Amino acid sequence: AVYHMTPPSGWLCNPQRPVTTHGAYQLYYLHSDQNNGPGGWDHASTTDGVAFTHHGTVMPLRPDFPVWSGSAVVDTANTAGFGAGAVVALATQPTDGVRKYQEQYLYWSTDGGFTFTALPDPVIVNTDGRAATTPAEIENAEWFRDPKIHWDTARGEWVCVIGRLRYAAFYTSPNLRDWTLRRNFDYPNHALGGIECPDLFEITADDGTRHWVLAASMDAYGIGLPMTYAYWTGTWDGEQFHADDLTPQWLDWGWDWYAAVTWPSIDAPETKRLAIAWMNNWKYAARDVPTDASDGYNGQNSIVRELRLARQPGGWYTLLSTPVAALTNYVTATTTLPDRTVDGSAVLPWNGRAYEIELDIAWDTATNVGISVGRSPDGTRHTNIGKYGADLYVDRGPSDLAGYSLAPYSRAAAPIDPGARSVHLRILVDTQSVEVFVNAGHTVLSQQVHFAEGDTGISLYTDGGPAHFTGIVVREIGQA
Ligand SMILES: OC[C@H]1O[C@@](CO)(OC[C@H]2O[C@](O)(CO)[C@@H](O)[C@@H]2O)[C@@H](O)[C@@H]1O
Ligand SMILES: OC[C@H]1O[C@@](CO)(OC[C@H]2O[C@](O)(CO)[C@@H](O)[C@@H]2O)[C@@H](O)[C@@H]1O
Predict the structure, then answer these.
(1) Pocket lining: 137 vs ligand 1, CB cutoff 6 Å
(2) Coil, strand or helix: which one is 327?
(3) N- or C-end of the chain: fewer Cβ atoms within 10 A?
(4) Domains annotated on the chain, with CATH
(5) Ligand 1 center from residue 190 Cα (angstroms)
(6) Whose CA is closest to atom 16 on ligand 1?
(7) SS3 140
(8) DSSP symbols for 77-137
(9) Which keywords are on file for this protein (predicted)?
(10) Does the beta carbon of 138 lie inside 6 Å of ligand 1?
């Protein structure tokens, strides 16, 4: 991967929300030496959100005692008692290796998050676990993970959300150590997802109003929805979360954008947040990928995106995504191709493996318009990005790789006004991925695609009528 974060070696999994220390963002992520094997927390720094510097393991796997997801905060006021500016983290671990005992362990660092010391006693015990007996109770006790910590400025205390089976739990605390149980957050459509890696934060919209957001990784495949990240805007009063609407909004419509996390940007912490996700899906994550045999590592994170909250008519709010601004500094060549009308198919005179392509498509009678990336000259391999019906689709089907096939999860789609007769597309292509930012970024589709060495072409296509392809610009992205 040219511009996507990958581990030096081993298995990459869930990223942990970054903390800001030493002028950079400190990213943590689950790492294991074996694919989908037991592991812990590794460390990587980044100052711009594009290039990362790996520092190795910081919260190691212990004998039959792995480290799962959680989060970390900079105890600036020294409320935890480990010192002013101490980086305090909570992480779920299966006590005694017992899954039904998975609970929250605290770790703290005095050097900005580079080395952590462990507090032996869990700060939030899995009481249900020890009482669980029925097959229903133990299943519940086996889903009490991923603590996301947030400082509630209004009440002056810490609030923490934990993912449970088809619901989320809340706890408050004045010192990150002693937690008081609050009311749960329930939602109607359980066919959505069971809440893993929940997110909790406050953000200011373009109209100046403050809002809370509760989100989480879901699995809504069964009902035709994504298996990525969904959020509910609302408010937290210190005892329970009030969603403005119980039907959540999605942040990505692609196949691979799981365990996503968000963090405040250094330059505008209240209005602009950064986000990054693990580009993988559990439907097939536990397996060997091309990079394993060629480089000994498995997994990459998505590009870092910027998030902002925009007011909508009717008084509701939605998030908007766009590639991290600094990516522009890694552009090594900018190629513009003349506008053109195509009726059927046409191959662009450009080839590459890591780049960003922007273009507009306007049509009338055409029922299908689109662009194909990673096109092999033998004409057999390619990934299709286009508009059909009410779908803005990304079909990685013709890019399936022998022995690493992603079937049947080939065609991802985001909703788009079927009445639209034009659309703007910003597409990021890298050696093992495709990320499509549609229009103004309200809808994004992220997916891993196993491109071959010769999958470097690009072609345009329409079905049922001509389409005008304009503003075509291709930006080659480099290592630095
Ligand atoms: O079975 C889960 C279901 O039960 C409710 C209450 O009706 O809460 C269960 C849950 O609340 C705790 O006390 C705290 O999170 C847990 O210990 C207990 O399992 C629902 O909210 C939930 O959907
Ligand atoms: O290569 C372009 C050509 O392929 C067709 C069908 O053979 O469409 C491909 C493309 O459209 C969808 O079916 C829309 O849902 C995608 O899933 C699929 O990738 C032609 O329409 C097009 O001209």
Answers:
(1) no
(2) helix
(3) C
(4) 1-326 (2.115.10.20), 327-480 (2.60.120.560)
(5) 14
(6) 128
(7) helix
(8) T--SSS-TTEEEEEEEEEGGG-GGGEEEEEEEESSSSSS-EE-SS-SB--HHHHH--STTH
(9) Glycosidase, Hydrolase, Transferase
(10) no
